[PDB]
Design a protein around this ligand. Sequence first.
Ligand SMILES: *[C@@H]1O[C@H](CO)[C@@H](O)[C@H](O)[C@H]1NC(C)=O
Ligand SMILES: *[C@@H]1O[C@H](CO)[C@@H](O)[C@H](O)[C@H]1NC(C)=O
Ligand SMILES: *[C@@H]1O[C@H](CO)[C@@H](O)[C@H](O)[C@H]1NC(C)=O
Ligand SMILES: *[C@@H]1O[C@H](CO)[C@@H](O)[C@H](O)[C@H]1NC(C)=O
Lengths: 115, 411, 96, 48, 49
Amino acid sequence: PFQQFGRDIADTTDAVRDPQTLEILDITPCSFGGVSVITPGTNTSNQVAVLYQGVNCTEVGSNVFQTRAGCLIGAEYVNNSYECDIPIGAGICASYQTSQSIIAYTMSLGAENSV
Amino acid sequence: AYSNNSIAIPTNFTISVTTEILPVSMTKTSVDCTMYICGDSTECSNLLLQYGSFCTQLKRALTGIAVEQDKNTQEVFAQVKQIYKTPPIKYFGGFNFSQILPDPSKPSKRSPIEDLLFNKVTQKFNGLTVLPPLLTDEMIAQYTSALLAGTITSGWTFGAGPALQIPFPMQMAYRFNGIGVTQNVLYENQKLIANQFNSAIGKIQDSLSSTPSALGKLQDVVNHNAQALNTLVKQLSSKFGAISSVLNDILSRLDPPEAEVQIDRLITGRLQSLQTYVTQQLIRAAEIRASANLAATKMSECVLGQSKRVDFCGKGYHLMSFPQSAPHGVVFLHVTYVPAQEKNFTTAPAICHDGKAHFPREGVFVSNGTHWFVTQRNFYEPQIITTDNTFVSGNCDVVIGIVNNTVYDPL
Amino acid sequence: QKFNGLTVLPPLLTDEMIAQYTSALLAGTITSGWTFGAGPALQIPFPMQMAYRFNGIGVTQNVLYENQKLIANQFNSAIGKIQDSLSSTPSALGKL
Amino acid sequence: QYGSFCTQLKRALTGIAVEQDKNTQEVFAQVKQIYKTPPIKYFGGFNF
Amino acid sequence: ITGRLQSLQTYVTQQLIRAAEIRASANLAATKMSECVLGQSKRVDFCGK
Ligand SMILES: *[C@@H]1O[C@H](CO)[C@@H](O)[C@H](O)[C@H]1NC(C)=O
Ligand SMILES: *[C@@H]1O[C@H](CO)[C@@H](O)[C@H](O)[C@H]1NC(C)=O
Ligand SMILES: *[C@@H]1O[C@H](CO)[C@@H](O)[C@H](O)[C@H]1NC(C)=O
Ligand SMILES: *[C@@H]1O[C@H](CO)[C@@H](O)[C@H](O)[C@H]1NC(C)=O
């Protein structure tokens, strides 16, 4: 009844009670982070793909894909698995392959062989 | 007990399995200056824009550390070229690899040892972010399973070149010939060795859960990372020789003439904190890279092949090694060969017969008090001394300690 | 203890303990060979151990058994020479 | 009121001391028992 | 205060680097002990010339 503020292990305000009504609400910082650009060689092509690290796609090419690393804009997901050259993060890789566009896909460990 | 004519040769052996845990990678992190040092204040941005170019070095060092950490796990688990799979019929000559092989019943294809290890060891306001690893848990598990399948089905052949199938008892016989004991020992004592292997696997499975201190290296790594992050966050909220820690109070209380000095002091303090953080991170990254190189070398010389190095792939004579995934590390299961029961005898360097000195060919002469036999060094297998077990060289007078006995001629 | 708060802590293992460990290792390698590292210590005469080492390097056991005295004399001379050398040149301890 | 560096200083120094203690521990203690030579030191003509 | 804190930080940074070098040397010494004293080594130029 007498407490008004809230504070986490790192001494940062977590929840604050508004002085007028008897309600308590959390305080979460609105989304921030870094941005990255995925492109092949500039001689190979000119298209680029932009990855927003650690932000949901709601906060943010017309293609939008939700990766565990972040939001990927400008690349499309494929139901395949290739030996990837551009590591995006969390098992997802991108490459420039066919009429031609950047494609995001899960890594392939290798050919499956049963001795 | 040392004597001029006394030698102790084992008569039995015990198969022992040991565990070694080695760190491989540490958590990837990034720092944003503007969000950390002041937190999107226009005055701080304007001042720091003209205050050096440290942030470029900070970001470059952090990115290099993250790339190196990604490479660390890449160079340890991806030593195989293909994803080998075990045959559906899991007999393996009486050996129970269930505790190390993946369990299809569990939703995640992870071995019971890996499950126990993972059960034991399980965006900040200031601009601290933790990047995800490129290789997920399932990918490392698949790599470990492929390595296990290769070493079970083909032996060491899948590392030198194409995978060549071989029955597991024959592979164990080859390992025994590698350590010095002959193949007969294994073929006659197959069931006992299988039982010892299963018992050792069960015992290490129980031990990994009995003592929680086995995962100390990985626990220390994660604790160090958490301590560094928490120390940075706590140290941000410090006076640093200023009127107040919160920049809002300075910017709303006093005029620019001394607010500039206050914010400059805060800038210096936070820059020093970031520099210390990245220096410690670089030192820790160097240590982790050394550990990862050691782990990769151990994988190469113990899992992909038998090692003659002493005390490298276990305690004793090395036979096999099985890798297991772990949070920010790898666990090695080392199977070793240890003599058990020692019996001493009387030995002589050579035998004098018809003025001809006979020397043992890959063996040692052994006497029980009334007759002399020849046997291997690491196991007691007496044999009648003949002209094929021994070779003749030199005369009888030169050797010191030579004894007289009769050698049988097959012809 | 320096005036500025500098203190040097003593090592957990003393000189005598390290000397005892070294002596134990020497006794093991002299009496048993390499057996005390793999498992239980197994006694073996030193000439037989040297013959095993010779077979390890490629030369046959005959070479040692026929030339035992010469090898013993060479070993003693080498030990004496290194003992003299460790005192002749003070630069050997440069790392420490 | 001036930061908390001294905790990091002391922790780093203590970790260094612990590692230095471990260094000598992992080099000389590879044997499990304290073997002793026999009283008669012949050793086949070798002078140890 | 700032001067002495900087001096202490430099001292412990150099001490950490030297400790890393000494740890590498100690690991090498332990490996040499294991592969030369506890057993014969087939590695070339590792346990002598
Ligand atoms: C303030 O006024 C509001 C009007 O709805 C009332 O609900 C609230 O209880 C008042 N403040 C207090 C005493 O909590
Ligand atoms: C791009 O690739 C083409 C063909 O491979 C090559 O001729 C060209 O030199 C490359 N660009 C650069 C900047 O090297
Ligand atoms: C590709 O995978 C997604 C993921 O569930 C799925 O929704 C989609 O149908 C797949 N594509 C095809 C052609 O089936
Ligand atoms: C074996 O060693 C024991 C003491 O350890 C000794 O009494 C015995 O005589 C030895 N055996 C032979 C055959 O000399």
